[PDB]
Write a protein that binds this ligand. Structure first.
Ligand SMILES: [Zn+2]
Ligand SMILES: [Zn+2]
Ligand SMILES: [Zn+2]
Lengths: 149, 202
């Protein structure tokens, strides 16, 4: 609403707050006026970055900061890992130790390649998918419902 | 009158109209209201030359006119036409004008998305990819035109998609001054003796 808009169609955004920007894996602001062109050629390629999209991969977002958009999208994904609860650790450092690397991964993934990140995530997934992810999924969804209630 | 209104009028008139319109509008910008005869003598334009310009400024309602009447020194009646700029209607009409361009640009963008990809070199007809199954002839193993019974090409379809974007995109880049100017302009009596004393003799 306050921001100019898409690098191409930066005009309707000033008119009304009903129109919302769309986020994509490329972390690029897009909307129907621009999106319609992305389907006629390439069929899912970022205009300036050229990065392909597996599908439409469009989601409604109302944040002017594309880094937050990426960081939130990354956050939401990374929260599926390393999210074991506090009772798992006896030492105070452990409660935020993994959160350090997790926040580094989330932050670094906004700029750096995910090669090492995916490898580490996969190397830990092979271990965490057995029990802690199964248990934390229940506790996370339960506490999420408690947050909603 | 905020300077932003004056600048907006000067920018739009100079951007999409001739200097005659700008010079005529500058007079109505420098002075809120000026007589047609004065503008005529100031601009030194001919009657039809200035009137046609004024009619355009009337067509887009950028200016308003009122008629004033008075008697000359010799006693003959005089009727002068006083023209004035109407920033309210001007900002409303330019917003419409630009919103219409947006709809046209959106239409041109949607057209750039709907443009046909296959084409015939004989009849110079372009066919949409939906017809591909109709254009492809298995007897030939390739696309052909029903009207020309000749080969139909497809790879040239990249040219119209790329080219149109170049013209349409630059429109928003150059209109930035007007958009900024618009964003900046969106806002005694004593009793008598007969009542004083007894009038009876006593
Ligand atoms: Zn990007
Ligand atoms: Zn765009
Ligand atoms: Zn043909």
């Amino acid at each position: 609403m306050d921001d100019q808009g898409c690098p191409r169609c930066k005009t309707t955004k000033y008119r009304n707050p009903s129109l919302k920007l769309m986020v994509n894996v490329c972390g690029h602001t897009l909307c129907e006026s621009c999106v319609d062109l992305l389907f006629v050629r390439g069929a899912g390629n970022c205009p300036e970055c050229g990065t392909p999209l597996r599908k439409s991969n469009f989601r409604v977002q109302l944040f002017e900061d594309p880094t937050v958009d990426k960081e939130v999208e990354i956050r939401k994904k990374v929260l599926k890992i390393y999210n074991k609860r506090e009772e798992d650790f006896p030492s105070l450092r452990e409660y935020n130790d993994f959160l350090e690397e997790v926040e580094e991964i989330v932050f670094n993934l906004t700029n750096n390649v995910d090669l090492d990140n995916t490898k580490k995530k996969m190397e830990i997934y092979q271990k965490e998918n057995k029990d802690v992810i199964q248990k934390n999924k229940l506790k996370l969804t339960r506490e999420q419902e408690e947050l909603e209630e | 009158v905020p300077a932003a209104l004056k600048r907006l009028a000067k920018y739009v008139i100079r951007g999409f109209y001739g200097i005659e319109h700008a010079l005529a509008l500058d007079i109505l910008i420098r002075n809120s209201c000026v007589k047609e005869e004065d503008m005529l003598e100031l601009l030194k334009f001919d009657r039809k030359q200035l009137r046609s310009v004024l009619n355009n400024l009337k067509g887009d309602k950028f200016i308003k006119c009122r008629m004033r009447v008075e008697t000359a020194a010799d006693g003959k009646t005089t009727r002068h036409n006083y023209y004035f700029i109407n920033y309210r209607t001007l900002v409303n009409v330019v917003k419409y004008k630009l919103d219409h361009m947006r709809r046209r640009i959106e239409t041109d963008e949607r057209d750039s998305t709907n443009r046909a990809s296959f084409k015939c070199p004989v009849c110079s007809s372009t066919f949409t990819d939906l017809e591909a199954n109709q254009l492809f002839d298995p007897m030939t193993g390739t696309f052909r035109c029903t009207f020309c019974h000749t080969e139909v090409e497809e790879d040239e379809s990249a040219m119209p998609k790329k080219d149109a974007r170049t013209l349409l995109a630059r429109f928003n880049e150059q209109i930035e001054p007007i958009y900024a100017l618009l964003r900046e302009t969106e806002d005694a009596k004593e009793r008598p003796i007969w009542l004083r004393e007894s009038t009876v003799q006593g």
